[PDB]
Scaffold this active site. Structure first.
Site, short mmCIF file in Angstrom:
data_model
loop_
_atom_site.label_atom_id
_atom_site.label_comp_id
_atom_site.label_asym_id
_atom_site.label_seq_id
_atom_site.Cartn_x
_atom_site.Cartn_y
_atom_site.Cartn_z
CE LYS A 50 72.77 5.52 58.40
NZ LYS A 50 73.02 5.54 59.84
CB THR A 51 76.01 6.26 51.13
OG1 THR A 51 76.99 5.26 50.89
CG2 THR A 51 76.37 7.05 52.39
#
Lengths: 205, 86, 393, 62, 82
Positions: C24-25
């Site tokens: 997600k990052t």
RNA sequence: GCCCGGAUAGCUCAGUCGGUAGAGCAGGGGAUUGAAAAUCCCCGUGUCCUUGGUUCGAUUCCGAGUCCGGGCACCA
RNA sequence: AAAUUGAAGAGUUUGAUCAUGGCUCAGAUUGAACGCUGGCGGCAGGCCUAACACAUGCAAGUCGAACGGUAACAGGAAGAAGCUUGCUUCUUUGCUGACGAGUGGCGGACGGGUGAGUAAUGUCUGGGAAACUGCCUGAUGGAGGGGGAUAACUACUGGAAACGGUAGCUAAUACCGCAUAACGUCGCAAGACCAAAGAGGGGGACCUUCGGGCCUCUUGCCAUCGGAUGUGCCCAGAUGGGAUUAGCUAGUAGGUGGGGUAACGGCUCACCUAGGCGACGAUCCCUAGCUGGUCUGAGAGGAUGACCAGCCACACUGGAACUGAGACACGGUCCAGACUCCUACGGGAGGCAGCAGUGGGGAAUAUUGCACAAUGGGCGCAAGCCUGAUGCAGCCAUGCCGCGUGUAUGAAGAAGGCCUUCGGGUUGUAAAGUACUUUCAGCGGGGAGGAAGGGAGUAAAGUUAAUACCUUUGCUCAUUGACGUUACCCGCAGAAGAAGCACCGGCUAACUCCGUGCCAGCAGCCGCGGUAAUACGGAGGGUGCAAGCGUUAAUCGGAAUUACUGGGCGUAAAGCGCACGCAGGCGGUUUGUUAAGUCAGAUGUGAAAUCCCCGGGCUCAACCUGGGAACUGCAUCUGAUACUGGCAAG
């Protein structure tokens, strides 16, 4: 600040005319004179040695139409001047433009005259004055602006000053719409609404 | 406060500080030449010596080396010894 | 004293979605890393793949849109949001603030709860503009099974009425695109091609009266209080007089600065994140439950009239009727707030799959006008979507 | 200090952070204060309309 | 060194000056040892608004004082004895 | 901005923290009294967290939220 | 151009009453908050808490007419070069304007802020004698000659940075002695002896290296004697607390000498004698800048120094020293302490209690303002430059005052509410209706003064070289407002944009009802409230104030309640259990004599600002400002001699 609400309320509590709302209601229907205001107006008001002072102070500030801040101001000025504060204040109270304009018929009430003085209707010395608290000088003339010479409320008021005695320090002429403030106001014709003994009592508190 | 818009009069103070320090000990220690004429007993030779001193004693107070009106007291303290002679 | 961000090309607020551990990052780093190589002209470089302490120190994801970058068509700002079920709130509000989202899923885990939750938000509260990335592709032992793994994502799209194959589903290994692997650096940048054209374009409500729903707030030492977030409407410039409304008493200040992404800003624009410095304001008073605006354009309210549709069990709605006296959670711009609800004359319940007129009564005020969207949730599920039809006192 | 709370309606708590003025009430032992309603975590008093400036109570409420 | 200078007085948009015997080691609107006159640069129909002491300035400049430029102007429109 | 825990009669104690919450202690009322205490004779409280959900079943489980404590977390 | 207007009572002891006396209380005020409410304008005001730490900006420097230099910019001058081609590029030349940077001269120590020290010779009030200075200014003299350095610049070079390092050149208004000097300096006198700097403008003649010189002017220097704003010392009187705060000192007390000082004294060192200071307050330890003056009150007295203004000390901490007239210092220099920050880990950087801004503390606080216009201050050879210094708009009900929010008139007063005897009454001429203007705000139009000086041109005068130069004025016109559509005024509708707040048992202005029914709370005291309460809470009405309102605290008052003003003590709290008697206080009566005090008198002073009285002005007021009144005393000295005091006798 000025009274925007119903003006005739006041006169009934204070046992005087206050020279406002000098009209009449037809055939004395619900005429509400000779009573104090409200449903409990037939009850007697109750006093104390300070209470008499507060009721007399309300009286004088409803006569001449001045704020408490204005009356506190003039009383400090009365005490700045030499002699006794009481008589020094009574000389201050009688000379101011809004009162001289009511005396001179420009306003059929106190509220017409205070609106006239604020709303540049009166010029004094020929120069426009937008404040109630201007001191008219002796042998000087208060003079209606052209845009106020049309006011039907003033034109009726100045006729209501004819064949009406005026305090002997001034005269007014309806036909000019101009009044001479002939001389200084005189305590031997008019004095203020308070007790000269009470005004020195509060410093002892 | 914290700042001024220029800084150069602060550096002018250090430039002056070091040229005064370097010669304030110079003008005062020459007096060892004067002291030998005090020891010789004779007022006129003592005085001539203090006159040999006067060139450096007025300039030491004119200049930054001790500042103010400090030549007067040095002349007074040294006289208060040699005026015992006659 | 700071350097100035210059409003050149159009500009968009976007964000990553999907689960924890999935990428997600990683994905949002890795796209921006290959963009500097491919769009920007650079050679694979060590300062390309790592990022500075100073951004990490503040952009902890859960309070700050920490990522700003450039592409051949637009500039982007980007928000980072929690991938876990312990905390979903800052996604479901962030959906109404963004023009679209970047969906990440990892083959190593398979699909997890937040890849299936965050995809729904574009129907439910926000906008249906999603582009997709299949992470950790290198792990799968057979390529022909990777191809079947990708048919899962086309199904997941098709669960929430996203077109299963006309959505752009890139295959990649975002940590390998990030570092500078020759095969995976070359299998990420297709995603920025789609980001430039799937939105298709931002459009900004910069004609309207200024509305900054505050996302977050900062305390500059010696200078005081800066309030920031995606601008929903209107404009700000330096020396404008400004009003804060919302959960507090209304007060007026002067906007004496205007910034974006820790740079001074020649003009604050709608549809993008903007910060405002404020004269004679102390860090003791302010909170994020506030909304900055042009004086007398919007007022705080606790009560409002609205239209709201109740979902059918088809749409993952209720199957039980929605009775009067419920306590749903509403979603308004950057913020959620809960209110007790009411139904029309002689209505004790409305059925699932039906529209009603409602009066709400919040437990705290927020700044509100007509035409503001919400969705409702009643705990275990979202159950409806609606709009404030007028405010009440 | 012991501090009097006037009129019915109590929003203050055994951790409510509040302001207090002087309240003279030697009628109650040691009590020399009065707790200001509608200040910090204390909200204004119930069933007031003759006060607006006192009790933090604003232009009138039930 | 002594000076004969303006030191400043009067309200916003409506200033005043007292002409004053001062030191440059002093504060402008602060310490002085004598008032030698007054200058109201704005006032109209105020007869008491303006004086300057020529006799006092003649004493001071004999003691080696200097007249500031406002004062050196004002003595040429005030009468050459005071 | 988010997340976590605590909400059995005024008090107390029980109750597979899934299976229609049960009992006690103290107190209040009335009478006495103009009123109260005390007394004498009668009697009640459950915010069993509010409110939506999950299920064959919610008191006790899950979300939503309040007060109060605690957690996650920032400096244009 | 004079002067005062001031002294209070009220609720509360009991069945009933007098006196004494506490408690509570009516008043005035604050750089005040809290909480509600708020439209307009003037001037004023906004940490009163952490001397607690500050991000970021911003606050005294400047002269090329002191010097050496030439980074920048333009120009001239000359060369060279290109069809930009007599128009155009490049170069050179410190040659000129000029100026980056260096050297050099005076102030930056000034203005502004803070109240942490200091109970103080700072400060207040008044004198004494051994003092001194930026710089302005009165006035006298002088300027000989010689030697010598080095940055900038030039080249070379390290470190992350601070910091620079290496080596070379040379100038002054920079460096130095001797010389040389006045009313100069020292010396008892003989006699010896003291400084330092030049630079700049310009013409007929005259030299000439054609640079320059000479000449003359201007500008600047140095020594020295005088004056003066400013500053220091000394001295007298005064300066909060703890006596359950009793010892303190020999660097003292006194003296003498050197040393030392701007000057002065054990300042300091030393000797010699032993004294000095205290329990009517040494000492010890605690607190506090002072004062004009601000608040309060008959004033005494108390509180108190803030807004304005005189003065002192201080600026995150500790040590030290210097720049310079003067500073262990706010704006500066070396080092340390703490914290913080940069860092290549070696090293370095910093202190808003300047201005704006801010975090924090706390009950609580303006815009990283604006401006060359005007005032002062610093440099300037002059034009000029600097300044958050200065002036001036903003924000905010922080302060004070003034104005407005409409008004003349107008009913079978009509409904309603409220109260009620149920008739009506009343709220209220209030509404409806009739009549009128727009002040102010808005918008528009017009627009004073704060402006003096300063610039240049041109003529004459002076200075002078016959002459320029140098400079002033006269005269011409060059030029000059931040605040700002200004102040102030005029136009224009139209009531249009302008009322909330507290109180009603008594003291306290307002009365009736209803409910809750000794409950909610209610008042400060007495107390109220236990189902028809002016004491609660509301209603309506009434009262009081008004864009401000209430309330809380704080100070002062009432208080005489520590009594001079102005008390009691037999007994109201209360006379020492008694005697004797020093300290200190007090002293019959008579003779003589004296007077600083007293008293008469005078001289010196408390200035300005501030204060007070009377004017003047900004339309009035608030606000601003003049004149005139005030300063009882204090320091010192003169007359009288009744008297305190002094001196002597009876």
């Amino acid at each position: 600040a000025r009274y925007l609400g119903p003006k005739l309320k006041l006169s009934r509590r204070e046992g005087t005319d206050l020279f406002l709302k000098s009209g009449v209601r037809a055939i004395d229907t619900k005429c509400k004179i000779e009573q104090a205001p409200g449903q409990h107006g037939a009850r007697k008001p109750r006093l104390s040695d300070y209470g008499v002072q507060l009721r007399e102070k309300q009286k004088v500030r409803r006569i001449y139409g001045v704020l408490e801040r204005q009356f506190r101001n003039y009383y400090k000025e009365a005490a700045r001047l030499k002699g006794n504060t009481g008589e020094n204040l009574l000389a201050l109270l009688e000379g101011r433009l809004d009162n001289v304009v009511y005396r001179m018929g420009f306003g059929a009430t106190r509220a017409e005259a205070r609106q006239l003085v604020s709303h540049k209707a009166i010029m004094v010395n020929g120069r426009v004055v937008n404040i109630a608290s201007y001191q008219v000088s002796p042998n000087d003339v208060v003079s209606i602006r052209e845009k106020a010479k049309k006011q039907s409320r003033v034109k009726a008021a100045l006729e209501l000053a004819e064949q009406r005695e005026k305090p002997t320090w001034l005269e007014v002429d309806a036909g000019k719409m101009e009044g001479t403030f002939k001389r200084k106001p005189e305590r031997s014709d008019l004095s203020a609404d308070i007790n000269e003994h009470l005004i020195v009592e509060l410093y002892s508190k | 406060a914290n700042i001024k818009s220029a800084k150069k009069r602060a550096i002018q103070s250090e430039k002056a500080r070091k040229h005064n320090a370097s010669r304030r000990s110079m003008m005062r220690t020459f007096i060892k030449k004067v002291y030998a004429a005090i020891e010789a007993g004779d007022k006129a030779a003592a005085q001539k010596a203090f006159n040999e001193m006067q060139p450096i004693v007025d300039r030491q107070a004119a200049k930054g080396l001790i500042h103010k009106n400090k030549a007067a007291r040095h002349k007074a303290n040294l006289t208060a010894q040699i005026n015992k002679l006659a | 004293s700071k350097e100035k961000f210059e409003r050149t090309k159009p500009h968009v607020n976007v964000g990553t979605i999907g689960h924890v551990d999935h990428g997600k990052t990683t994905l949002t780093a890795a796209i921006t890393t290959v963009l500097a190589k491919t769009y920007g002209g650079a050679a694979r470089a060590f300062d390309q793949i790592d990022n500075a302490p100073e951004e990490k120190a503040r952009g902890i994801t859960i309070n700050t849109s920490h990522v700003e970058y450039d592409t051949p068509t637009r500039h982007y700002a980007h928000v980072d949001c929690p991938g876990h079920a312990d905390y979903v709130k800052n996604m479901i509000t962030g959906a109404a603030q963004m023009d679209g989202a970047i969906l990440v899923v990892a083959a190593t885990d398979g699909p997890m709860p937040q890849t299936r939750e965050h995809i729904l938000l574009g129907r439910q509260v926000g906008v249906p503009y999603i582009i997709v990335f299949l992470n950790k592709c290198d792990m799968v032992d057979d390529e022909e099974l990777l191809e079947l793994v990708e048919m899962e994502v086309r199904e997941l799209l098709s669960q929430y009425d996203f077109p299963g194959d006309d959505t752009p589903i890139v295959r990649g290994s975002a940590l390998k695109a990030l570092e500078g692997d020759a095969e995976w650096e070359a299998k990420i940048l297709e995603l920025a091609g789609f980001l430039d054209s799937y939105i298709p374009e931002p459009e900004r409500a910069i004609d309207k009266p200024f509305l900054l729903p505050i996302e977050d707030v900062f305390s500059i030492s010696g200078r005081g209080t800066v309030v920031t977030g995606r601008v929903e409407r209107g404009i700000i410039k330096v020396g404008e007089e400004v009003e804060i409304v919302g959960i507090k008493e209304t007060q007026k200040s002067t906007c004496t600065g205007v910034e974006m992404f820790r740079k001074l800003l020649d003009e604050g624009r709608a549809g993008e994140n903007v910060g405002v410095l404020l004269r004679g304001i102390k860090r003791e008073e302010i909170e994020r439950g506030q909304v900055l605006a042009k004086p007398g354009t919007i007022k705080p309210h606790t009560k409002f009239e609205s239209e709201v549709y109740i979902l059918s069990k088809d749409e993952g709605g209720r199957h039980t009727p929605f009775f009067k006296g419920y306590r749903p959670q509403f979603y308004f711009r950057t913020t959620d707030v809960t209110g007790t609800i009411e139904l029309p004359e002689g209505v004790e319940m409305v059925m699932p799959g039906d529209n009603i007129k409602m009066v709400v009564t919040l437990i705290h005020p927020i700044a509100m006008d007509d035409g503001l969207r919400f969705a409702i949730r009643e705990g275990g599920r979202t159950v409806g979507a609606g709009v404030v039809a007028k405010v009440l006192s | 200090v012991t501090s009097y709370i006037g009129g019915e309606g109590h929003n203050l708590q055994e951790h409510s952070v509040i302001l207090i003025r002087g309240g003279r009430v030697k009628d109650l032992p040691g009590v020399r204060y009065h707790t200001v309603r509608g200040a910090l975590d204390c909200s204004g008093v119930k069933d007031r309309k003759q006060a607006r400036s006192k009790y933090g109570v604003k232009r009138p409420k039930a | 060194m002594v000076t004969i200078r303006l030191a400043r007085h009067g309200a916003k948009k409506r200033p005043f000056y007292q002409v004053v015997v001062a030191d440059s080691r002093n504060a402008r609107n602060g310490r002085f040892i004598e008032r030698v006159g007054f200058f109201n640069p704005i006032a109209s129909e105020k007869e008491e608004g303006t004086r300057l002491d020529l006799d006092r300035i003649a004493h001071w400049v004999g003691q080696g004082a200097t007249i500031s430029d406002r004062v050196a102007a004002l003595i040429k429109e005030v009468n050459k004895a005071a």
